[PDB]
Design a protein around this ligand. Structure first.
Ligand SMILES: Cc1cc2nc3c(=O)[nH]c(=O)nc-3n(C[C@H](O)[C@H](O)[C@H](O)COP(=O)(O)OP(=O)(O)OC[C@H]3O[C@@H](n4cnc5c(N)ncnc54)[C@H](O)[C@@H]3O)c2cc1C
Ligand SMILES: Cc1cc2nc3c(=O)[nH]c(=O)nc-3n(C[C@H](O)[C@H](O)[C@H](O)COP(=O)(O)OP(=O)(O)OC[C@H]3O[C@@H](n4cnc5c(N)ncnc54)[C@H](O)[C@@H]3O)c2cc1C
Lengths: 363, 363
């Protein structure tokens, strides 16, 4: 028997770690040879020396249970995972944990080695350093984070953020929250260009210092900057499984699962993390909760016992998450509950990934 | 000099308590002779003996600085508060804290004495007790709370909740939260009739046990119940001030204020709580924060010093609010912050109002 995990993200490494703890045979597959703590990728593209903390070697943790490769197909009938180098991996159980993909710096999902990936982010750090004026394209989570991280490291730089909507950040967020994102950026001094769409975006020179670049919008508006960072358009990564289940995907590319996180047509394929079509926000935190359920259900499948149900609204959230302030912001109420915001821990929980991987953080 | 406060709600009693602590002369005006902890009104209409904890005598706390009356006009030029009994109260500073109004049991804003108000809720408790089947009209906060409180006290009663929208609760809440409200009610066994509008609502027999009442919807749907509770339609109470500022109100009846919570046309009128037109959710918690700012600014006005600014997103929120569980539910993220839900304390913070009023809770 063999559990194959496609995707070594937050979900995948949680599932692999747990399968190893249970001594279930498995192979974890990822394009990269290192786990990417992608939440901290924007900080890594700004703050010198930080990128080394955001990649963690898979093989050091998992040895022969890790296999680097780019999955270009899944055959659910013969139970094969098909790689871009022609090899095929049979499975008895398949966990799809393929996450979301988008432009660098926000995402870095490609076939690359750890040192080269760290050096790609370090190169970006020097380009940022060189540039007095920087445009960020995209007002979603990655763009807001990039604007904020630049102004944190370099409070005197001129940062402009352009965004096609009326308000920043994900529509599913409370507008009270969207407006607060605007106000957080304005407090840091970022200049906002909302409802404002870059024209001929494909001709931009990105991730590079270049004096006096002129960026035009569809409104004819112009700004002159020394570097352009693309933070538009993170979408669920269906590359592994599109040819097998494309006709059955949700609109956004996510996989439809039952209450046990099994794919609807199968009892031995599961989806976790962003790529599962759940009615919950796509977070690293939930990807890990999904992994617990799926590993439990693989165990129960071996033992012919009843499967566990994924309960959204897990109560396992404590002061450990967030900071130690104990402070919050009341944002609303409803039956039995209050809505609150708390500050993220400003290490962006990097240390938890090194803990999960059983590796000391770099010196 | 005299600060007149119209409305002895959460905001008004906070402002009055603080003005008394500062020894600023004031008169607090409310229709009722007792403060109503309106958050717990639905529980008070269900649980025997509980209503006595939800009304607190104004005069016991404030003596001659409280005046019962129903304000039917404000004259901002002569600086008069006009009462329905013909009397007028001059002010040097006016705080409008008029809150929101709606049907009983959710709201109880009328000229009435404390013992009669408690007895009105106790009467409702016996009508609920008598009724095996109960319809709740309205899926906003009051209706959801009424359905939940009935099924908490009487898990075997048949409770139906009818609501005109597709989903329950305030649209400004996350749909993830609206759906969770649905799931909280379904777990308690409430039968939901969504997208479903009661026909001839004015002919219903409400707040009364009556066997075999037939309720028809605009869809022709019918249900047979023994009691009907109206929880539709809490709206900002502009009765005090409509004739003075109606032309300048926001659409929902709220008052437009500047960053110091002063009414736009005046330096000596302030608005706090629900009746202030702020871009924040209307809660008792915020009404009290508004009162702090306004009292500070009245002091600063006396001393000819600069006014304080109301900063939405106050950081003064701790584990004291909520329960002691320390547990939460992660609901989302954004720059620097996580969105979380925590459980309300299940006394619905009744004890804090008695503390504010300096009165021991009833035996
Ligand atoms: C700016 C920003 C901030 C965020 N902050 C937070 C936060 O504070 N908290 C939080 O909980 N979440 C946060 N998130 C969300 C978080 O990044 C994702 O929800 C999380 O990474 C999802 O984990 P996952 O396991 O589903 O996939 P990922 O972590 O995206 O990992 C997927 C992996 O699959 C691999 N893969 C995909 N397709 C293939 C293929 N065909 N072949 C081989 N390998 C493949 C990729 O190489 C990748 O390593 C943030 C996101 C952004 C953009
Ligand atoms: C079901 C439900 C649950 C809630 N739960 C919470 C919660 O958990 N936490 C939270 O923070 N908020 C909660 N709220 C919101 C909370 O009830 C209100 O935001 C709060 O009462 C606002 O306080 P206020 O001072 O603005 O006005 P109110 O508390 O409504 O007081 C206004 C007062 O003004 C008086 N008044 C009005 N007009 C006149 C007039 N013309 N003359 C004389 N007197 C007048 C009324 O008699 C009344 O006493 C809840 C609301 C509901 C409906």
């Amino acid at each position: 028997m063999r559990v194959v995990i496609v995707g070594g993200g937050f979900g995948g490494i949680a599932a692999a770690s747990q399968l190893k703890s249970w001594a279930v045979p498995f192979v974890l597959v990822d394009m990269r040879d290192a786990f990417h703590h992608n939440v901290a990728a924007l900080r890594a593209s700004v703050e010198s020396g930080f990128a080394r903390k955001t990649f963690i070697s898979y093989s050091v943790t998992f040895g022969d249970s890790f296999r680097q490769g780019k999955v270009v197909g899944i055959d659910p009938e013969r139970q094969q995972v098909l790689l871009s180098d022609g090899e095929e991996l049979h499975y008895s159980h398949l966990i799809l944990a393929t996450g979301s993909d988008g432009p660098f710096p926000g995402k870095f999902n490609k076939v690359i080695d750890m040192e080269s990936a760290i050096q790609t982010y370090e190169d970006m750090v020097k380009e940022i350093e060189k540039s007095e004026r920087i445009l960020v394209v995209g007002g979603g989570a990655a763009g807001v984070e990039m604007a904020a991280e630049i102004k944190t490291e370099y409070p005197a730089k001129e940062v402009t953020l352009i965004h096609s909507k009326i308000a920043l950040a994900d529509v599913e967020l409370l507008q009270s929250v969207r407006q607060e994102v605007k106000e957080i950026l304005l407090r840091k001094g970022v200049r906002l260009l909302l409802s404002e769409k870059v024209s001929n975006v494909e001709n931009l020179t990105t991730n590079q210092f270049q004096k006096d670049m002129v960026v035009r919008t569809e409104k004819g508006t112009e700004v002159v900057v020394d570097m352009v960072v693309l933070c538009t358009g993170i979408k669920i990564n269906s590359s592994a499984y599109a040819t097998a289940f494309g006709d059955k995907l949700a609109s956004n590319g996510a996989l439809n699962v039952n209450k046990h996180l099994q794919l609807e047509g199968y009892d031995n394929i599961y989806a976790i993390g962003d790529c599962a079509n759940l009615k919950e926000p796509k977070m690293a935190y939930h990807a890990e909760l999904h992994a617990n359920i799926v590993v439990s259900n693989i165990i129960n499948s071996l033992t012919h016992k009843p499967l566990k149900t994924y309960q959204p609204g897990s109560l396992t959230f404590l002061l450990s998450m967030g900071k130690n302030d104990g402070v919050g912001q009341v944002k609303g109420y409803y039956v039995g509950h209050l809505l609150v915001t708390i500050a993220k821990s400003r290490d962006l929980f990097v240390s938890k990934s090194w803990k999960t991987m059983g590796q000391p953080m770099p010196s």
